[PDB]
Structure 1
């Protein structure tokens, strides 16, 4: 249901990120583990402290996954086919956790992009993140 205005806002907002994707992904992950501790059950025996290379490593992976999703906004189901299969049959993360990570991504973008986080871009990014979560949960059942 992504509108052409949404694609323009998401591309412009994520375009300002650029090389800061790996740092923003690690920040949004730490925000999720702190605000929603129930999400930590999916990363057992992981180093979840601040400045952890384990957290910073996975933060770049999710960021590169979102970077590929923005470039393939019109081909999102086929671009995230490897991740949708992994999250559905291997990780089996409950779909309620996707809303928690999507919310922390919006908070990270708002805190880091003060000029680009307009109410129009805010609504566009929330719809885009909801579409990515729906794609990653489409192959669950």
Structure 2
């Protein structure tokens, strides 16, 4: 798991996201979609987005960005004790949305990318390390639920 010092770093870094949840959420999804176009296909409601301009201009994408990060934020605030919050998400993403674990890897890297892009020089080495650990924990616990379901 993460140490108390690491969880404190994670939640301190999260303060940035919380100041502009929709902005960070939007940029995270845009980074995901632009870097990995196949991920867009998993969203029947965003597949109509053909350009990054259309993406940035989408209020609904911004809306989903807020939904995605608010959920992740709630999980992070649990500092590891997130089974109840994590289980349903892993299950809807495996059973309903069919999101391979690889895409969760992509979005994790996208979150790291967005923090550096929006806060250059203000996302220290220790901060990136702690946030990475937290995102790997989140990803790994979902992977467990995926194996349980036999989802690939």
* TM-score, with length taken from structure 2: 0.84
Give the secondary structure class of the aligned counterpart of 1:137. Answer: helix
Give the secondary structure class of the aligned counterpart of 1:80. Answer: helix
Gaps of 5+ in 1: none
Q: After the TM superposition, which residues 61-100 of structure 1 pair with which residues of structure 2 at under 5 Å, given as runs? A: 61-100=67-106
Contact 2:42 2:98 in 1 (8 A): no
Q: After the TM superposition, which residues 19-30 of structure 1 pair with which residues of structure 2 at under 5 Å, given as runs? A: 19-30=19-30
Gaps of 5+ in 2: none
Two-structure CA RMSD over aligned residues (Å): 1.7
**Counterpart-to-counterpart distance in 2, 1:118 and 1:19:** 18
Give the secondary structure class of the aligned counterpart of 2:144. Answer: coil
Alignment size in residue pairs = 141
101-110 or 48-57, larger mean C-alpha shift: 48-57
Task: Determine which of 103, 109, 124 is the counterpart of 1:103.
Answer: 109
Deviation at 1:63, TM superposition (A): 0.9
**Counterpart-to-counterpart distance in 2, 1:51 and 1:133:** 29
Q: Is 1:39 paired with 2:45?
A: no
Give the secondary structure class of the aligned counterpart of 2:19. Answer: helix
Contact 2:32 2:110 in 1 (8 A): yes
Q: Is 1:128 paired with 2:137?
A: no
Match of 2:63 in 1: 57
Give the secondary structure class of the aligned counterpart of 2:44. Answer: coil
* TM-score, with length taken from structure 1: 0.89
Segments of 4+ in structure 1 off by > 3 A?
none
Give the secondary structure class of the aligned counterpart of 1:138. Answer: helix
